[PDB]
Design a protein around this ligand. Structure first.
Ligand SMILES: Nc1ncnc2c1ncn2[C@@H]1O[C@H](CSCC[C@H](N)C(=O)O)[C@@H](O)[C@H]1O
Ligand SMILES: C[n+]1cn([C@@H]2O[C@H](CO)[C@@H](O)[C@H]2O)c2nc(N)[nH]c(=O)c21
Length: 291
């Protein structure tokens, strides 16, 4: 068995302290180990992001515009969680594909069947006025050309919608398929437990102050670093059993999940953080139909 003792998990990309040369053979390895693993990955990250905004007092009264929201099964859990806490939020889910019917019939959630473009963003901005906007993007076209187009669209989402905060899908093009340098919003690179086994994807979390929008250039040398840091995390770290983590599941991803869930607010008062987390995890897995 692959045992180890850890203090905390890598919560952000910047904390990864080592790297490994990417082995193309990893692409053939088992990518997922749990049913609806993708919904779980998304739910944990967005719950983490949203609970942070609650902490800063920027969630209440906002309209969450989620682009690339379909099927969006996990979004029903998020909506219920904050709705039950007494937080007032309006949800606007936009995608060209159809959403999970469990999202229907809620006065606080609007479903839109449309593929967004710059022109549409303008029209919704005019209509959402004067509500504060929280942007969540999970759009998917891939090729480096596909990625660049998605990232360009994501920057336009921020420029046109002018959100108070945002969570953006972020995966750096692989160096071997580099095309040209580009810019992304400055923010924290939140790492994702339950991401596919060898995925280099993370979520860019940003909070906007004043009327400023700070961007950061991404170069091919940055791309090499992303590839090696993420490969080390995936090949080595995520395959660790944290034996000093007293929890029903000691695998790294559960240890990491624990640290994200401990930041979530609940109506029910618990005697220990461990108690709250086991409760939240149980609740989450039951909702998604994960054993
Ligand atoms: N311009 C665009 N506007 C809206 N949705 C888009 C888009 N381009 C791609 N997409 C959507 O991006 C989605 C990627 S999969 C998204 C999964 C979703 N976040 C969930 O929680 O289940 C697809 O449904 C796709 O239709
Ligand atoms: C996380 N990952 C997936 N692929 C994908 O796996 C295939 C075989 O190696 C590649 O062709 C690419 O799609 C990666 N490619 C590179 N160069 N680097 C990566 O970190 C990588």
């Amino acid at each position: 068995m692959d045992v180890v003792s850890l203090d905390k998990p890598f919560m952000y990309f910047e904390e990864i302290d080592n790297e490994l040369d990417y082995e193309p053979e990893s692409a053939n390895e088992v990518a997922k180990k749990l049913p609806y693993q993708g919904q779980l990955k998304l739910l944990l990250g967005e719950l983490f992001f949203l609970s942070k905004l609650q902490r800063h007092g920027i969630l209440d009264g906002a309209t969450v515009v989620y682009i690339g929201s379909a099927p969006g099964t996990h979004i029903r859990y998020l909506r219920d969680h904050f709705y039950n806490l007494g937080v007032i939020i309006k949800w606007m889910l936009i995608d060209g594909r159809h959403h999970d019917p469990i999202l229907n019939g809620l006065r606080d959630v609007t479903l839109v069947t449309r593929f967004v473009d710059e022109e549409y963003l303008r029209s919704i901005k005019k209509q959402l006025h004067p509500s504060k906007i929280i942007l969540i993007s999970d759009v998917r076209s891939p090729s480096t050309a596909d990625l660049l187009s998605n990232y360009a669209l994501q920057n336009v989402m921020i420029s046109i919608l002018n959100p108070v905060a945002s969570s953006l899908k972020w995966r750096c093009p692989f160096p071997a398929q580099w095309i040209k340098d580009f810019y992304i919003p400055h923010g924290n690179k939140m790492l994702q437990p339950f991401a596919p086994s060898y995925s280099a994807e993370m979520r860019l979390l940003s909070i906007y102050t004043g009327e400023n929008m700070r961007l950061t250039r991404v170069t091919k040398s940055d791309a090499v670093n992303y590839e090696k840091k993420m490969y080390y995390l995936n090949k080595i770290v995520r395959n660790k059993v944290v034996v000093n983590f007293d929890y029903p599941n000691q695998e790294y991803d559960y240890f990491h999940m624990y640290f994200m869930l401990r930041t979530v607010y609940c109506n029910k008062t618990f005697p220990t953080t461990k108690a709250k987390v086991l409760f939240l995890q149980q609740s989450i897995f039951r909702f998604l139909n994960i054993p």
